[PDB]
Amino acid sequence: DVSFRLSGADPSSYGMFIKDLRNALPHTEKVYNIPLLLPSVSGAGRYLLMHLFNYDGNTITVAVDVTNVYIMGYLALTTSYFFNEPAADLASQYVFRSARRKITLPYSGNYERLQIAAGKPREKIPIGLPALDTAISTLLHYDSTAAAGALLVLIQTTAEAARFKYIEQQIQERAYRDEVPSSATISLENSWSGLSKQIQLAQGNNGVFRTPTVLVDSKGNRVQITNVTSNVVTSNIQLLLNTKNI
Numbered sequence: 001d002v003s004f005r006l007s008g009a010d011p012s013s014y015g016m017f018i019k020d021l022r023n024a025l026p027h028t029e030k031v032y033n034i035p036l037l038l039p040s041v042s043g044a045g046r047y048l049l050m051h052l053f054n055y056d057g058n059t060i061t062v063a064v065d066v067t068n069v070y071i072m073g074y075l076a077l078t079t080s081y082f083f084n085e086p087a088a089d090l091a092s093q094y095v096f097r098s099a100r101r102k103i104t105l106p107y108s109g110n111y112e113r114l115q116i117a118a119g120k121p122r123e124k125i126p127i128g129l130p131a132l133d134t135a136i137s138t139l140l141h142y143d144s145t146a147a148a149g150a151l152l153v154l155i156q157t158t159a160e161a162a163r164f165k166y167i168e169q170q171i172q173e174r175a176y177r178d179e180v181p182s183s184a185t186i187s188l189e190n191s192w193s194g195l196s197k198q199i200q201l202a203q204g205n206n207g208v209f210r211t212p213t214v215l216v217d218s219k220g221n222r223v224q225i226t227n228v229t230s231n232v233v234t235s236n237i238q239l240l241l242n243t244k245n246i
């Protein structure tokens, strides 16, 4: 398991949590020195548990699929909650089985569905450590509309930060003040699968992408990533979605 406590949290302790999260995901090989997530894991070993504690010390446990860093569900006191999707239902066969009751959320875990449920795009939802504190607190008691926004915050401040150093740094900058994600942050989130694929395809193609990936940079400028010498590949991305899952 991995843990993070909002009480006394700072950029360093958050950085340690994101390091722990990354290090808890298994891999047998690296591609261009980036860990390649496994094609599959059978049984309960597929799921990592993240223990998150809000400022008051109340906690939820979040179940994460270690092959794709997708959040499947979470436990709050004696109630488990899972996304309304086959991968999440499968996860519910292995984690939080001791919950007194299980609620299936009225949406799947993908960004478009969560944004519909929340009533707003994540362009408009502030993120940061204070927002994460709020998100944990919200998830402690069932409210499906509120939970959608909370889960958008949760996914970005955990999984997406694990996947991209830039996003981790963006949250560290929001340690004591929330701010909506940069357009670059959104671009990277939307491009993780694509980047992961092209970095793997580059292995037998002299480091060259078969298809360029279009991103937005830190200054709001759109750019094409064409090969593995790009800063996105050398410095930023920290985990690759296995092409067998793309």
Ligand SMILES: *[C@@H]1O[C@H](CO)[C@@H](O)[C@H](O)[C@H]1NC(C)=O
Binding pocket: 208, 226, 227, 228, 229, 230, 231
């Ligand atoms: C590879 O990417 C670099 C740096 O982003 C770029 O300047 C260059 O034109 C690209 N080279 C090839 C062969 O695609």
